[PDB]
């Protein structure tokens, strides 16, 4: 074996053989396969505009202004998913977010360990999904840590009230005692 692989299987197992505190225990019990395929289907409309094609619409916005036309008077308030850890902590404290999504593999685990406790207190329905990179693909990033819907348009409000009800009923309604007991030690 190489010099590093025999570490790469051992830190896999020392997360199992030790006593995981109940704060960290919930970060391995995770939203399932099925209900984690509709959340990202709703989000794949509300992606942030790719930075290359936000400029593309900006040169198409700045060419008519150079002639006399405009669209700022008729520009409706935009929509997208809201990301970034520091922007989503303030979206929960202000009770603006409605669905917080926590990655299950943030490397320093303290970055997100207060979020399932903050979402329980502020009444923001939450779920812990796999693969921080899977969130990163949503927002044109390498690794995202968290996302949040704060406002979908009137088109998907009826869809969102249904998909949250799948999030509480599978993550929050279940997983209710494994978050209240220690983990690991297998």
């Amino acid at each position: 074996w190489p010099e590093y692989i025999r570490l790469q299987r051992r830190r896999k197992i020392l997360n199992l053989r030790l006593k995981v505190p109940p704060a960290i225990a919930q970060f391995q019990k995770t939203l399932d396969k099925n209900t984690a395929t509709q959340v990202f289907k709703l989000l794949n409309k509300y992606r942030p505009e790719t930075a290359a094609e936000k400029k593309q619409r900006l040169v198409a916005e700045a060419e008519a202004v150079a002639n006399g036309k405009s669209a700022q008077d008729v520009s409706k308030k935009p929509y997208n998913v809201k990301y970034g850890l520091n922007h989503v902590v303030a979206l929960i404290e202000a009770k603006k977010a409605k669905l917080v999504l926590i990655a299950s593999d943030v490397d320093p685990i303290e970055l997100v360990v207060f979020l399932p406790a903050l979402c329980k207190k502020m009444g923001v329905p939450y779920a812990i999904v796999k693969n921080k990179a899977r969130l990163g693909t949503v927002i044109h990033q390498k690794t995202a840590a968290v996302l949040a819907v704060t406002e979908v348009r009137e088109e998907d409000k009826n869809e969102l009230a249904s998909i949250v009800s799948a999030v509480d009923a599978n993550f929050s309604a279940k997983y209710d005692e494994s978050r209240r007991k220690w983990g690991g030690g297998i």
């Binding site: 704060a23 900006l58 700045a62 202004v65 520009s75 404290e93």
Partner: protein
């Protein structure tokens, strides 16, 4: 190893937390874009940015590259439809002549011989 003492986060807080009022810059066009538009708009008047139609039509005169500049500043064996020298096969009519399917394998073998067979 006790259970999880959620003595505080047991309930739900109903209010928001930060009390400073909502700023006015969340209810109007993004003034950072409006500054960004004016940088692009100015750039058109100085003619450094080709515009959106110019984004399209200057791609279309390209991708036509077929030798636009000058770089230089065995035979048949008398075989035909009615060959009487020997009696391949003799074909009475050109319309009755079939298609010799071995030419694809023969020409590829000759092409592969110049690159793989030695000389």
């Amino acid at each position: 190893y006790p259970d999880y003492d959620d003595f505080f986060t047991n309930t739900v807080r109903e209010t928001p937390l930060s009390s400073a009022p909502e700023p006015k810059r969340r209810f109007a066009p993004s003034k950072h874009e409006q500054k960004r538009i004016l940088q692009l708009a100015y750039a058109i008047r100085k003619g450094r940015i080709l515009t959106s139609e110019q984004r399209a039509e200057r791609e279309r005169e390209s991708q036509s590259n077929y030798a636009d500049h000058d770089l230089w500043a065995p035979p048949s064996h008398e075989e035909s439809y009615n060959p009487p020298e020997e009696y391949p096969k003799k074909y009475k009519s050109l319309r009755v002549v079939p298609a010799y399917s071995n030419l694809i394998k023969e020409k590829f073998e000759r092409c592969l011989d110049l690159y793989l067979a030695p000389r």
